[PDB]
Amino acid sequence: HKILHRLLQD
Amino acid sequence: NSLALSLTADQMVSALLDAEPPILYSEYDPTRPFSEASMMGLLTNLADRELVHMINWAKRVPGFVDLTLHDQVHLLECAWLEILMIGLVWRSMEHPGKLLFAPNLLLDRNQGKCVEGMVEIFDMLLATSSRFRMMNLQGEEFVCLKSIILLNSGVYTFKDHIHRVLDKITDTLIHLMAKAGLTLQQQHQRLAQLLLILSHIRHMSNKGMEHLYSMKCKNVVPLSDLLLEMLDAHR
Numbered sequence: 367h368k369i370l371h372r373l374l375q376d
Numbered sequence: 377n378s379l380a381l382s383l384t385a386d387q388m389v390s391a392l393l394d395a396e397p398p399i400l401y402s403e404y405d406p407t408r409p410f411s412e413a414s415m416m417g418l419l420t421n422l423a424d425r426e427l428v429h430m431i432n433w434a435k436r437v438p439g440f441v442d443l444t445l446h447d448q449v450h451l452l453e454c455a456w457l458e459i460l461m462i463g464l465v466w467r468s469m470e471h472p473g474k475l476l477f478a479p480n481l482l483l484d485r486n487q488g489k490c491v492e493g494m495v496e497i498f499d500m501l502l503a504t505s506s507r508f509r510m511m512n513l514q515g516e517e518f519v520c521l522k523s524i525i526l527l528n529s530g531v532y533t534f535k536d537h538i539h540r541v542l543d544k545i546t547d548t549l550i551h552l553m554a555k556a557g558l559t560l561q562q563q564h565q566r567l568a569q570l571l572l573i574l575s576h577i578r579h580m581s582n583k584g585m586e587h588l589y590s591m592k593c594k595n596v597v598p599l600s601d602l603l604l605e606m607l608d609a610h611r
């Protein structure tokens with residue numbers, strides 16, 4: 367679960 | 377069908393322009409860094425905050441949103457340092473011999489010396505900056521190059537979509553050069569010159585990545601979890 371995965375959503 | 381391919385050259389340009397991330401500042405401390413700890417601390421801190429902007433910038437790059445989250449992730453992990461670096465070089469154009477990491481942070485090769493294996497990378501960055509200056513690189517051209525790095529660097533490590541979007545940007549570059557009054561021959565010669573610099577940008581990225589890795593092992597300079605994961609993707 368990458369931080370990048372989260373930031374690319376929002 | 378991606379919207380990007382339906383955009384006009386002028387519709388490609390002011391979108392990249394408008395999508396540009398702002399120029400961030402470093403710590404307002406007037407102490408010129410000479411130690412590795414102080415220098416790399418400022419660099420990584422700045423890099424951390426820039427990454428957040430780079431991420432929202434990439435999402436504004438036409439054709440990028442039409443990709444799967446996984447692909448978007450892969451491309452950013454691959455090009456993030458190339459993108460940071462070409463931005464550094466662009467900002468440094470008007471400051472010969474200087475690297476403008478931030479308006480309040482200009483470093484020279486003398487400060488790179490105080491960090492083993494850093495001076496070589498600075499010299500490469502300075503040379504790239506100089507090259508950009510002599511070619512009289514234009515902002516409209518810079519933004520096109522930066523987008524190309526985003527879509528190109530990881531395109532293989534994976535389809536036509538990206539190739540079609542890359543062609544679209546190629547059309548835009550020529551458009552800008554013709555609009556600038558360049559001859560037909562001057563156009564394809566400048567196009568070649570610009571793209572060949574990407575090879576050198578990739579090189580500097582790979583060298584910087586290695587240096588950032590060894591630095592991670594020494595675990596002296598603190599690295600944000602985001603940097604670690606971005607850096608991690610390169611193994």
Ligand SMILES: CCn1nc2c(C(F)(F)F)cccc2c1-c1ccc(O)cc1O
Pocket residue numbers: 418419420422423426460461463464477494497498583584585587588
């Ligand atoms: C932290 C990202 N980074 N790393 C750089 C290196 C390296 F890898 F060798 F340590 C050398 C030169 C610049 C480096 C940067 C960097 C580049 C652009 C920028 O705006 C901020 C940076 O920290």
